[PDB]
Amino acid sequence: STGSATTTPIDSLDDAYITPVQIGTPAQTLNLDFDTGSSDLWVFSSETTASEVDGQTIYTPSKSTTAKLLSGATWSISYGDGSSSSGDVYTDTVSVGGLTVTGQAVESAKKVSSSFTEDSTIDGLLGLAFSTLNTVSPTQQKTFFDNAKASLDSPVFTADLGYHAPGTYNFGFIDTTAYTGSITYTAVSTKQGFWEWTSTGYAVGSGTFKSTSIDGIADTGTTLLYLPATVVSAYWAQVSGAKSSSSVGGYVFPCSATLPSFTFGVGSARIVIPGDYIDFGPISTGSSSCFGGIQSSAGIGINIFGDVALKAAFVVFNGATTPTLGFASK
Numbered sequence: 001s002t003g004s005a006t007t008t009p010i011d012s013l014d015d016a017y018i019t020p021v022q023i024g025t026p027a028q029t030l031n032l033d034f035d036t037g038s039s040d041l042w043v044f045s046s047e048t049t050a051s052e053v054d055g056q057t058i059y060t061p062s063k064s065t066t067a068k069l070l071s072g073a074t075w076s077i078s079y080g081d082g083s084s085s086s087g088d089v090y091t092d093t094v095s096v097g098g099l100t101v102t103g104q105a106v107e108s109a110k111k112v113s114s115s116f117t118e119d120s121t122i123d124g125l126l127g128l129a130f131s132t133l134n135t136v137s138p139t140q141q142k143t144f145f146d147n148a149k150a151s152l153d154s155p156v157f158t159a160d161l162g163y164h165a166p167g168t169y170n171f172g173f174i175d176t177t178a179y180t181g182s183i184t185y186t187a188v189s190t191k192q193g194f195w196e197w198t199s200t201g202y203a204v205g206s207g208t209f210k211s212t213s214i215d216g217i218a219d220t221g222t223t224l225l226y227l228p229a230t231v232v233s234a235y236w237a238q239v240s241g242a243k244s245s246s247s248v249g250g251y252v253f254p255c256s257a258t259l260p261s262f263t264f265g266v267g268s269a270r271i272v273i274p275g276d277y278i279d280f281g282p283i284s285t286g287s288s289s290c291f292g293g294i295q296s297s298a299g300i301g302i303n304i305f306g307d308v309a310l311k312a313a314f315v316v317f318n319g320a321t322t323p324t325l326g327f328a329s330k
């Protein structure tokens with residue numbers, strides 16, 4: 001089997017991407033944020049505290065003839081930005097782009113933090129990291145991909161995120177028409193539960209490539225590219241007037257600037273992030289100070305290849321016995 005679904009930016013900055021997911025019988029379609037940096041499939045639901053729901057579409061398990069309470073199971077997750085959610089669990093039929101998993105754990109939120117409430121476009125998360133990070137207790141649950149894998153034509157999924165445009169998530173096959181050149185594969189460590197890999201270096205603009213190992217995670221659920229402070233300083237030093245603002249919480253630059261590209265290495269191959277991808281717009285409405293899309297990871301404790309990086313590539317998440325990651329230009 002295979003599945004193929006379009007993923008759509010939630011706003012004009014590509015802050016996140018949402019993908020329609022069918023849950024239950026008859027189907028309830030929710031728009032989920034596919035996240036290769038976490039491993040819980042959780043949704044806004046009929047159980048979510050009413051004051052914490054503001055415009056999202058909800059899952060109502062009582063309206064699904066295939067929903068079954070997963071008795072005694074609870075979940076609770078805390079994310080890198082301080083956001084969180086928690087609740088109870090149902091198993092139900094879940095389909096993505098024509099690929100169906102029966103018996104998928106659907107984590108129903110009873111509570112969500114303010115950042116989720118305030119985003120009416122995201123109806124929940126679909127985690128695509130390793131199932132060892134799933135938070136359901138006392139019986140840990142598998143991700144949608146892990147449950148589907150043995151049925152897929154190939155044990156893979158791909159992320160092809162668009163710049164100011166929709167993209168695609170494919171399950172079980174590699175669309176050889178979706179990229180240029182060849183795919184370069186690189187080793188993954190699963191020891192922390194993430195798609196954790198090592199970039200071989202970077203370049204800023206037309207500058208020389210610096211060979212240096214940069215460990216980090218391929219993370220579709222984070223908007224920006226978070227790298228060591230050394231790398232980030234070398235980038236922004238090429239932009240007149242850019243500076244790190246403690247008040248704003250990172251690097252800002254004059255909205256009048258034209259930004260240089262940023263290249264990262266994948267083995268001997270190179271992925272080029274165009275300058276325009278690094279512009280996240282005014283820090284507040286009407287400001288002439290713009291927010292940078294490359295920021296320091298210091299204090300996060302991990303480097304994060306978020307959407308700014310991934311959307312410059314066709315990315316293969318290879319869930320073979322020894323997982324690997326592939327990157328191609330497109």
Ligand SMILES: CC(C)c1nc(CN(C)C(=O)N[C@H](C(=O)N[C@@H](Cc2ccccc2)C[C@H](O)[C@H](Cc2ccccc2)NC(=O)OCc2cncs2)C(C)C)cs1
Pocket residue numbers: 015016033035036037038039077078079080081082083119125133134135219220221222223224300302304
């Ligand atoms: C316009 C508005 C709606 C939006 N702003 C954003 C930008 N934001 C907030 C982020 O990128 N926030 C990032 C974040 O926490 N992302 C998260 C939550 C999230 C989900 C959906 C939408 C938005 C956020 C999702 C990410 O995959 C992070 C990556 C990570 C991993 C380890 C350590 C630190 C970080 N995953 C986790 O935090 O997983 C932690 C886990 C805990 N237990 C099991 S896994 C930070 C790391 C920067 C997106 S949409």
